[PDB]
Design a protein around this nucleic acid. Structure first.
Lengths: 217, 192, 203, 56
RNA sequence: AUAUUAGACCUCGGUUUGGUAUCGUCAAUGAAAUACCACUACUCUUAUUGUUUCCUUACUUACUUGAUUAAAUGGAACGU
RNA sequence: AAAGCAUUGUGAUGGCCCUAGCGGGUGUUGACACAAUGUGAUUUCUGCCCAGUGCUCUGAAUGUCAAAGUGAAGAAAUUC
RNA sequence: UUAUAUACAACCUCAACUCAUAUGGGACUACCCCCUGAAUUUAAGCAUAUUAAUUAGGGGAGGAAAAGAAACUAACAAGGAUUUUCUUAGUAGCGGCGAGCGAAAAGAAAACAGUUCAGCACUAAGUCACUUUGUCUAUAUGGCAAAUGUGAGAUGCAGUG
């Protein structure tokens, strides 16, 4: 029912997870998942709280983000690994695409910028209201504090219809102490970031792809 | 139906290993009537002649009572704790065998509260401890200890769970033991 | 010590260990007399802390009392009066079943003082109690100065006068405000005072 | 010793259905809002604590 | 990407390097573009312990009742 | 009052009655009895009426409909 | 031991005695404690109310009794066990909001007195009652010691607290 290369019937101590330098047989490193489940809290209506697991750490995430800008993004960011697209290559993304044999929706999350409220509500109808890759200025990144670190392990949640989300909590390219470092930061930040919440949650089951899901107390 | 704190007693330390228990506990009887204050007339020579601390020569014997032995286990000064099965009402002993496990002291339950009382020279003793381990006789104390531990300490996971009592008895079991004769034999003689 | 575990163990009266202990101790004590000597105190953790010691002669006696209100003993040719007077079958005593319990022991044992009483079991028609009673002319109750107060003469039949802990509660004795009108003592000491009509000399 | 009935009758009403009914049933068995709240927070503390040590 | 494999490494499998492999992660074109990968849901099936105007049968140990100077009750056994 | 006549209840964990409570009377009883009533020996007869009222019926089940229990709303009191 | 066939023991629950020693009932009525509890009356009738948490009935003590050293007040600049008097006050309240009823804190006096248990790492049952033997000096339910004789006591006696 559950393999015990990560123990789960024997419940977890912090002293046992640092054996996992000898966990991985594999050289290539792919994603282990943020898997949040919002039951008792329906997100399809205006019921929505906007936070991010702000990691101070880099567990090496494996991906890419294309961003925007109209006199608003990269007056500071040319030492910050940036492109400064003029923000209307977004119908380059809506029913036009980047190329054949790779999609324009092939990214993480998109950029609600300051000049492009001209474009949001229904002009993104068959582009991004259709897709589901569009956050708002709630994104915790408009090239303000964490631009590459948005792509590199700080990204928020825009939720599944059946409440089964899968984005990066971290990876398998961690060290032997990093397994107790990502959730060690949310011991103060997401305890009340859940809005109007005594404790309406218990499911904290961090999934790995190169192993069983790490289930928490 | 008896709820499984009752019975622990009566899984009371069957005879061949509780006979060597009192073979050992005959050496730690507390007092003798004349010999307590025959030792306190060997203090009379310390009044004028001895002039030192000669006659105490540190004691070692059992500790009786139930309020005493509760604070031999809550400090872990106790090395072997004897309890009694036939205590009334029960409550002055009911906490005890669970606390010898929670504090990790090898306890045993013996048959007799009069059995222990006659070794502390009184009527009924209810429970005992053993703070001493005195070095010349730790051998036969040794294989008493684990032999006590198998049916009392390591068993404290079904002792917490399994007890019924619940006997049906005795002409009522004998009534249906004719019914399980006949209801079986009706489809055991079904072929003719 | 053991005496502090017994205090919490006995608070678990709706448990399963301590339901099928005062199961087997309500159908032993009701296959015997209404009023009965006891060789021990059956709850020796509550006996002491009421006053009992293991000295001769402290003596324990069990009772039982009959668990209900007070049917008013009017002759079935029932109460003649105004309609506030007509209640028969739903009235309650002013003394409790424990009050009336050690009352029934102090009469039948006039040669002994009642110290304190204590619940040991009940089921549906009989609550019953132990009662710590003391042989006051014994040569160990009198020679020993801690208990020795009740060997006096203001302690003859204290339980028939409201002076044990059980008979005391019926009276309504406390401080301050809520317990006001028995404020001179009794309750009737207070009606005597509150109705006392002082004509003065100089008035 | 274990629990009384009304603790076990509301531990099973605490795993699933209506924590508001674990505080109407506890305010009938106790029955004040201050003692019901103190017992619903200590049954639901050994519900979660035995959710630890039932496995290991 | 893995699987696999021989060699550098390891006592060896194994790791690693590269080859090979299933839709694909991507195209087409939309209301989700779905590799490599999980926290699971409603019609049901299991298997362990659950309100009730629940329901029937059965038990004995509370309790009720009768009888007796509380004498032969319940089981077996041989002998027919 | 009576004898005669009739009706009623009761097969006992019952009917009737006493009792504050325990408990008792009938009862050393058992339907040819006990208890409750009307009529009043014999003779001859005892018509019609179950609308009102009383008594009565496993029985009519949903018009009414107690507390307890159960469900919901509310921060709870509590109201539905 | 216990095929209920030899004992033996020890406890535990209960007996019995013209056993040793003791203890208790009954009286009084003014005051005192615990209970039970009316109706006349008034309300211009009368049922709640009133009379009255009283007459009568029942039980228990003492020279006093009960109470009594905070699960009390207050809302202060704070007070500090009980009981009695003065005042609060015929007040707040309660009431067919009718008849009627009706306290307390504070303040001022009288008097003043404070404590003990159960339950803890008291840390050698360190306790008690008998009985006998020495032996004190009331006509002693005394005083001390001896035997520590027999028992109470580890289901908890003393000391500390």
């Amino acid at each position: 029912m559950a393999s015990k290369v990560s123990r789960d019937t024997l419940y977890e101590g912090v002293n046992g997870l640092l054996e996992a330098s000898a966990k991985k047989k594999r050289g290539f490193l792919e994603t282990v998942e943020l898997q949040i489940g919002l039951k008792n809290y329906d997100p399809q209506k205006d019921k929505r709280f906007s936070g991010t697991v702000k990691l101070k750490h880099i567990p090496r995430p494996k991906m890419k983000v294309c961003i925007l800008g109209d006199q608003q993004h990269c007056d500071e960011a040319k030492a910050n690994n940036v492109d400064f697209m003029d923000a209307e290559a977004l119908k380059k993304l809506n029913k036009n695409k980047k190329l054949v044999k790779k999609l324009a929706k092939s990214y993480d999350a998109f950029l609600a910028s300051e000049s492009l409220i001209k474009q949001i509500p229904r002009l993104l109808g068959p582009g991004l209201n259709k897709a589901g890759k569009f956050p708002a200025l709630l994104s915790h990144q408009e090239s303000m504090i964490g631009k590459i670190e948005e792509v590199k392990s700080t990204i928020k949640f825009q939720m599944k219809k059946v409440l089964c989300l899968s984005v990066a909590v971290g990876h398998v390219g961690m060290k032997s102490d990093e397994l107790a470092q990502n959730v060690n930061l949310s011991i103060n930040f997401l305890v009340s970031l859940l809005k109007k919440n005594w404790q309406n949650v218990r499911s904290l089951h961090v999934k790995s792809s190169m192993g069983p899901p790490q289930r928490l107390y | 139906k008896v709820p499984p704190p009752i019975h622990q007693f009566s899984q009371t330390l069957d005879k061949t290993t509780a006979v060597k228990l009192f073979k050992l506990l005959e050496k730690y009887r507390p007092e003798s009537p004349l010999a307590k204050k025959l030792r306190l007339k060997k203090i009379a020579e310390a009044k004028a002649k001895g002039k030192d601390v000669e006659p105490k020569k540190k004691p070692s014997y059992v500790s009786a009572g139930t309020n005493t032995v509760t604070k031999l286990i809550e400090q872990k000064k106790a090395q072997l704790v004897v309890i009694a099965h036939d205590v009334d009402p029960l409550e002055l002993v009911l906490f005890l065998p669970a606390l010898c496990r929670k504090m990790g002291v090898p306890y045993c339950i013996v048959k007799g509260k009069a059995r222990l009382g006659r070794l502390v020279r009184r009527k009924t003793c209810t429970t005992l401890a053993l703070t001493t381990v005195d070095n010349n006789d730790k051998a036969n104390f040794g294989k008493v200890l684990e032999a006590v531990k198998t049916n009392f300490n390591e068993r404290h996971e079904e002792i917490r769970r399994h007890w019924g009592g619940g006997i049906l008895g005795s002409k009522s079991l004998a009534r249906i033991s004719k019914l399980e004769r006949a209801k079986a034999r009706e489809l055991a003689q079904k072929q003719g | 010590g053991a005496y502090r575990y017994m205090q919490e163990l006995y608070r678990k009266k709706q448990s399963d260990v301590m339901r099928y202990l005062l199961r087997i101790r309500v159908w032993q004590y009701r296959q015997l007399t209404k009023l009965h000597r006891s060789p021990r105190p059956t709850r020796p953790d509550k006996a002491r802390r009421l006053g009992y010691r293991a000295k001769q002669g402290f003596v324990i006696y069990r009772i039982r009392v009959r668990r209900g209100g007070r049917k008013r003993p009017v002759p079935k040719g029932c109460t003649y009066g105004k309609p506030k007077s007509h209640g028969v079958n739903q009235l309650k005593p002013y003394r409790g079943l424990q009050s009336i319990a050690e009352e029934r022991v102090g009469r039948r044992l006039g040669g002994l003082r009642v110290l304190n009483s204590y619940w040991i079991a009940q089921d549906a028609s009989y609550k019953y109690f132990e009662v710590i009673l003391i042989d006051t002319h014994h040569s160990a109750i009198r020679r020993d100065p801690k208990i020795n107060w009740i060997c006096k003469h203001v302690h003859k039949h204290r339980e028939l006068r409201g002076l044990t802990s059980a008979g005391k509660s019926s009276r309504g004795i406390g401080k301050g405000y809520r317990y006001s009108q028995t404020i001179g003592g009794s309750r009737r000491a207070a009606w005597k005072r509150k109705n006392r009509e002082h004509m003065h000399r100089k008035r | 010793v274990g629990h009384a009935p009304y603790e076990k009758r509301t531990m099973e009403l605490l795993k699933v259905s209506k924590d508001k009914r674990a505080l109407k049933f506890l305010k009938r068995r106790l029955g004040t809002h201050i003692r019901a709240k103190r017992k619903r927070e200590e049954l639901s503390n050994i519900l979660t604590q035995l959710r630890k040590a039932q496995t290991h």
